[PDB]
């Protein structure tokens, strides 16, 4: 039935045309299928998913977006990311990510002022989220100490 409908129109029955190339202007060998597929357009556009953060908000735990990266918040260097990074051996990159790029507010602002000066130094500092954990597990009778 579809073949006969094709043959009614002045169209090839095989359903394939010889699409000449747009740039080379040469015939495509192995004639290619051409037809009118009903292409939709899904709601998942890109301009509502093109996100990027330099430095914005912070939380009580000094995480950037915490609950919702829609408030101009950075990506989550998630649980598996630190494994996939330390598997290489990116100690400096990992230390960046989880101390000076995300958590160590003193170190974070110090490195910001450093980068705006051409120099690219880094200060480890103490991850403020680790200080939050320290205070929490210390607030329940279990004494915790950064003993040296």
């Amino acid at each position: 039935e579809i073949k006969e409908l094709l043959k009614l129109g002045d169209l090839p029955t095989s359903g394939q045309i010889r699409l000449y190339d747009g740039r080379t202007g040469e015939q495509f060998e192995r004639p290619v299928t051409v037809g009118y597929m009903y292409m939709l357009k899904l709601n998942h556009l890109v301009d509502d998913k093109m996100h990027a953060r330099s430095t914005g908000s912070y939380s009580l735990v000094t995480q950037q977006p915490l609950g919702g990266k829609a408030q101009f918040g950075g990506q989550r260097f998630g649980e598996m990311e630190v494994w996939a990074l330390e598997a290489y051996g990116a100690a400096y990159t990992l230390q960046e990510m989880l101390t000076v790029k995300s958590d160590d507010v003193n170190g974070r602002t110090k490195m910001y002022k450093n980068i705006v000066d051409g120099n690219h130094q880094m200060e480890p500092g103490m991850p403020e989220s680790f200080n939050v954990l320290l205070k929490e597990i210390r607030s329940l009778g279990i004494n915790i100490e950064l003993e040296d």
Binding site: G118, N119, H120
Partner: protein
């Protein structure tokens, strides 16, 4: 610009010592006043450090030699 690091690691063949030595060299070339002993071609300090390594000019012991030479020249003008 450059693409690979094999010609760099081959003489620092731990692939981790390379990172440390080229990092401190790029430090002395970026925050310090040292000029690249390898010609610069609009290239950042990292690839410049790699090029200085691949030319058989910058290595860990050479960096220590430069550091102690700077120390001697500093303490020579303090006496």
């Amino acid at each position: 610009a450059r693409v690979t690091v094999q010609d760099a690691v081959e003489k620092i063949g731990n692939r981790f010592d390379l990172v440390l030595v080229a990092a401190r060299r790029a430090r002395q070339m970026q925050v310090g006043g040292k000029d690249p002993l390898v010609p610069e071609e609009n290239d950042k300090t990292t690839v410049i450090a790699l090029r200085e390594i691949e030319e058989g000019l910058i290595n860990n012991q050479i960096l220590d030699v430069r550091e102690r030479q700077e120390q001697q020249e500093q303490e020579a003008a303090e006496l």
